Amino acid sequence: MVLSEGEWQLVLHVWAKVEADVAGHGQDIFIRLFKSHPETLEKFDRFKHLKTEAEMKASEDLKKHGVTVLTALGAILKKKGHHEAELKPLAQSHATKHKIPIKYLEFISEAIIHVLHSRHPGNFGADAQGAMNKALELFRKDIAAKYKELGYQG
Ligand code: HEM
């Protein structure tokens, strides 16, 4: 796939709003993911034990991880599709150390879209949501191809 420049514009325009508060957005997103698809919490040895959304909100480690994740995603989105180098180390650790199935990347992509919709309704109308969805599908597709070359397709 290939996004057009106007689509990339819609995606970086709302991403600039997220970047005003990266830790808050990282928190909302992981909490939405864990509540919606609790099985994903099992992949985190560091977080597994968290029992409630209150514990999640209070976890500093989880907040730090949210910032690490969104910063890496933001760097990939700003590449506008030329993200080969960025995706290499990411694909290697998620396929051979963490073992994150594409399915879970679909689940956080839904959590991202839900939180942007909630927080940024004015900058995240239908067209902007379509462009973000397209950018995340491109991301998933390129990572799934890398997983395959690495021997994990999963
Ligand atoms: C937008 C998608 C994602 C991006 C951009 C991303 C980014 C990162 C980065 C940059 C790290 C630290 C470096 C490394 O380990 O490679 C990390 C670690 C990790 N990610 Fe991902 N990730 C994403 C989605 C996921 C998902 C959906 C899951 C799980 C259900 C997950 C599970 C983990 C785990 C277990 C670690 C290690 C955490 C540790 O204990 O510190 N990641 N991720």
Swiss-Prot record:
Its main location: cytoplasm. Heme b binds at H94. Pfam families: Globin. GO terms for molecular function: heme binding; metal ion binding; nitrite reductase activity; oxygen binding; oxygen carrier activity; peroxidase activity. One of its GO terms (biological process) is removal of superoxide radicals. Signal peptide: none annotated. It is found in: Cytoplasm, Sarcoplasm. It comes from the Eukaryota. PROSITE patterns: GLOBIN. The modification Phosphothreonine is found at T68. Monomeric. Monomeric heme protein which primary function is to store oxygen and facilitate its diffusion within muscle tissues. Reversibly binds oxygen through a pentacoordinated heme iron and enables its timely and efficient release as needed during periods of heightened demand. Depending on the oxidative conditions of tissues and cells, and in addition to its ability to bind oxygen, it also has a nitrite reductase activity whereby it regulates the production of bioactive nitric oxide. Belongs to the globin family. This is Myoglobin. The lineage of its organism: Eukaryota, Metazoa, Chordata, Craniata, Vertebrata.
